[PDB]
Design a protein around this ligand. Structure first.
Ligand SMILES: *[C@@H]1O[C@H](CO)[C@@H](O)[C@H](O)[C@H]1NC(C)=O
Ligand SMILES: *[C@@H]1O[C@H](CO)[C@@H](O)[C@H](O)[C@H]1NC(C)=O
Ligand SMILES: *[C@@H]1O[C@H](CO)[C@@H](O)[C@H](O)[C@H]1NC(C)=O
Ligand SMILES: *[C@@H]1O[C@H](CO)[C@@H](O)[C@H](O)[C@H]1NC(C)=O
Ligand SMILES: *[C@@H]1O[C@H](CO)[C@@H](O)[C@H](O)[C@H]1NC(C)=O
Ligand SMILES: *[C@@H]1O[C@H](CO)[C@@H](O)[C@H](O)[C@H]1NC(C)=O
Ligand SMILES: *[C@@H]1O[C@H](CO)[C@@H](O)[C@H](O)[C@H]1NC(C)=O
Ligand SMILES: *[C@@H]1O[C@H](CO)[C@@H](O)[C@H](O)[C@H]1NC(C)=O
Ligand SMILES: *[C@@H]1O[C@H](CO)[C@@H](O)[C@H](O)[C@H]1NC(C)=O
Ligand SMILES: *[C@@H]1O[C@H](CO)[C@@H](O)[C@H](O)[C@H]1NC(C)=O
Ligand SMILES: *[C@@H]1O[C@H](CO)[C@@H](O)[C@H](O)[C@H]1NC(C)=O
Lengths: 412, 67, 99, 98, 49, 45
């Protein structure tokens, strides 16, 4: 009831979070899938009505939504911001994640690692509206805004600010007094630069780290491979092949065999489209989450504990990836605590003093006030504290003597 | 007319990454996405009039004056 | 009829270990176990920090601590009596079994 | 344009909120539901191709996700913190919930 | 069986939305202090168990 | 001057607009400049 542990040191940390944003846009010619363009089957398929048209309408809804997702995630920026020639961001690295001029598509080094580690029977695949090169310009724009101008490019035009002062801001946003940055700038820059360096090794070590993106690539290949394999199925018909039936059984009997192949192939196609509608809803839930983390973690700083990497959130950098996005969340983690005696308030002369910000502690021999998230003791004073009533009502108050910095000047 | 995924050999005429695009005029200059096509191409009715097709501009470029 | 129900990976005892751990962290160490190790802090001070987070000055807790403790203990008493008295509160879970 | 109301007192309140997290993990052998025991019918089902595997795969995906949901909700804590033996919690009583 | 599995995929997707909401409330309301009005029951939020 | 960060409003730099933390040696890019003392008019009463 009188013990508090305060962190005397901390670590900047960089946590890599990976999110799917879009599926491979797909549209299927249901007549070329079912009938193979062989007219005797098409003249049966016409008798089923809207089961021809509405599957292309449903897959067109899915295909357009992949562009809408990718637009909402990356195109949050009002202008294509680009980085100055000078790179003196207070020592903080910014090279492995900014564009590389040697890369043909102007991707960053870490974007190239991600683009390496992730890997027609009436079916058609459609291109994305934004190419990988265009997405790599948006992830450069969001990054060059974030480096040169803080959160301000999310509120209006980008307002430049020196990068050490933007970090001083972002420390001041997590209840650490900004002097803790400036007094440690070289150490904080080294912890950050080292933490970026470990991302390249981490992403190099195993493809199993990118499981969320490798999954959305695998499941669409697995669905289409199964949709193609279902052409090789009888559904009660004499043969799995249409022009074979039309050569053997005479038109009267042929029709009953073909109507099974139509029913079976169509039920397989409705099963595939239904599964893609559900998978597209799961990917949209991920794309809305990614569109939220662009707004809150990149374009801002978030108070939401464990929404934006573990520890207190400082900032994040987006990097593009095949069918998705990767955030490098930068977080402050407190790391080397000591135990201290503490009391909720102190007594001066007949008055209870409470700390204005921070908390009271003692090393066992002296009483100090410290900020809550980093041990930095200050002598307890009439500006560091405020009074609220007599020396009784509080439970566990201690006796002390508060220094009043005006009284030595009133010696004049 | 866009022929999705075709080479023009198989069909003004313009080859895009999305397909052989017919009746539109290719323009090098870049503009907003007015009508989407695919693989960064977009089309519009900018003026003396025909449909044009061009690589879309993602926004006005701006080098922030940081020091 | 070829239908089967599989066991959960975490048993209800293991869920009770995790809710115990989350709760004992939350009582002894505030939010700090959501970042670092669980830094101990006296619970009356953890409530003073949480009051300071709603624009109410820390002294409003300590000047009312014995009152605030009785309001909290009474409120938990009403939850325990309410959940004891009627099953009607758990609709959001019972509906998932029923469906 | 010149009136404000200010609270002179408070209540602490406790509000229960309830969220479901897992379905009952359920799985079906599609051959045993559709046919059941008959080797004749089991051979006839092969004419329908992939549906038997595809439906058991979809139920396996749902069934595996219930363990993931439960860990994503509760397994947020790195260590099993233990409540102390002495309850000096400034009068606040947590017996009912510890 | 196709009807049952299709409806269980949709129901399981609704339970995933509820499990992500519960993981979000676990992360913000327990491990922190929400400043998001009426995300944590009525009133200003203090903590949750 | 010092300003609030979201609207240009210059305040004269004073010991109550600002807080001390140690020497200059460690602060990269610090400048000099007077900081005014609001007590000074009554320090010289
Ligand atoms: C704090 O921790 C870092 C490692 O994260 C270490 O290099 C440094 O010496 C420690 N102490 C100081 C000076 O803050
Ligand atoms: C970032 O670190 C890399 C390490 O290889 C170095 O080559 C690069 O010049 C550094 N960039 C800056 C501007 O700090
Ligand atoms: C604080 O106290 C605990 C228990 O006595 C002890 O294990 C720990 O080493 C002490 N120091 C720290 C790390 O705060
Ligand atoms: C803490 O509890 C012990 C119980 O014996 C008591 O003696 C002590 O005075 C209490 N201290 C505070 C700070 O309330
Ligand atoms: C503080 O000193 C007063 C006498 O001036 C005494 O009555 C009171 O018990 C003391 N309290 C503590 C915490 O020692
Ligand atoms: C299309 O056909 C022409 C034939 O000369 C060939 O050169 C070209 O590489 C082909 N590919 C496309 C899509 O332009
Ligand atoms: C685009 O540039 C090429 C360069 O070879 C040129 O031949 C072509 O006429 C240009 N088209 C337009 C519309 O300017
Ligand atoms: C405030 O309300 C509580 C009941 O919620 C009551 O016990 C207490 O006496 C009240 N205090 C004032 C200042 O009226
Ligand atoms: C807490 O509640 C339990 C059950 O009512 C009771 O037995 C125990 O004495 C209470 N403890 C305190 C600190 O009031
Ligand atoms: C900024 O960089 C330039 C060139 O290295 C240097 O001359 C100047 O002193 C630096 N100013 C600050 C504030 O560090
Ligand atoms: C401030 O003045 C001192 C001499 O009193 C000088 O040594 C120091 O370099 C000056 N600093 C700046 C940044 O002007």
């Amino acid at each position: 009831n009188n013990s508090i542990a305060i962190p005397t040191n901390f670590t900047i940390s960089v946590t890599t979070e990976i999110l799917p944003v879009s599926m491979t846009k797909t549209s299927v010619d249901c007549t070329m899938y079912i009938c193979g363009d062989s007219t005797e089957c098409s003249n049966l398929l016409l008798q089923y009505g809207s089961f021809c048209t509405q599957l292309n309408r449903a897959l067109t809804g899915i295909a357009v939504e992949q562009d809408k997702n990718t637009q909402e995630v990356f195109a949050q920026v009002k202008q294509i911001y680009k980085t100055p020639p000078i790179k003196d961001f207070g020592g903080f690295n910014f090279s492995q994640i900014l564009p590389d001029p040697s890369k043909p598509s102007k991707r960053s080094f870490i974007e190239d690692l991600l683009f390496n580690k992730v890997t027609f029977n009436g079916l058609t695949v459609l291109p994305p509206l934004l190419t990988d090169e265009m997405i790599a310009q948006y992830t450069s724009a969001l990054l060059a805004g974030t480096i040169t101008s803080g959160w301000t490019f999310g509120a209006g035009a980008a307002l430049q600010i020196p990068f050490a002062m933007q970090m001083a801001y972002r420390f001041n946003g997590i209840g650490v007094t900004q002097n803790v940055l400036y007094e440690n700038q070289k150490l904080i820059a080294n912890q950050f630069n080292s933490a970026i360096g470990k991302i390249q090794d981490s992403l190099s070590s195993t493809a199993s780290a990118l499981g969320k993106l490798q999954d959305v690539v695998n499941q669409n290949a697995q669905a289409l491979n199964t949709l193609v394999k279902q052409l090789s199925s009888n559904f009660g018909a004499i043969s799995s092949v249409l022009n074979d039936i039309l050569s053997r059984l005479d038109p009267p009997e042929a029709e009953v065999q073909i109507d099974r192949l139509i029913t079976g192939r169509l039920q397989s196609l409705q099963t595939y489209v239904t599964q893609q509608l559900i998978r597209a809803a799961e990917i949209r839930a991920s794309a809305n989450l990614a569109a939220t983390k662009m707004s809150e973690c990149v374009l801002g700083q978030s108070k939401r504990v464990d929404f934006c990497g573990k520890g207190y959130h400082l900032m994040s950098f987006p990097q593009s990836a095949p069918h998705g996005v990767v955030f490098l969340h930068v977080t402050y983690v407190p790391a080397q605590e000591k135990n201290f005696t503490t009391a909720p308030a102190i007594c001066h002369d007949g008055k209870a003093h409470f700390p204005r910000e921070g908390v009271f502690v003692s090393n066992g021999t002296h009483w100090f006030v410290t900020q809550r998230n980093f041990y930095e003791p200050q002598i307890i004073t009439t500006d560091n504290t405020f009074v609220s009533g007599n020396c009784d009502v509080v439970i566990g108050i201690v006796n002390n003597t508060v220094y009043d910095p005006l009284q030595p000047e009133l010696d004049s | 007319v866009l022929y999705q995924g075709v080479n023009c050999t198989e069909v003004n005429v313009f080859q895009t990454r999305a397909g052989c695009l017919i009746g539109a005029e290719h323009v090098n200059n870049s503009y907003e996405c007015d009508i989407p096509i695919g693989a960064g191409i977009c089309a519009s009715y900018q003026t003396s009039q025909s449909i044009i097709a061009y690589t879309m501009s993602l926004g006005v470029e701006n080098s922030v004056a940081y020091s």
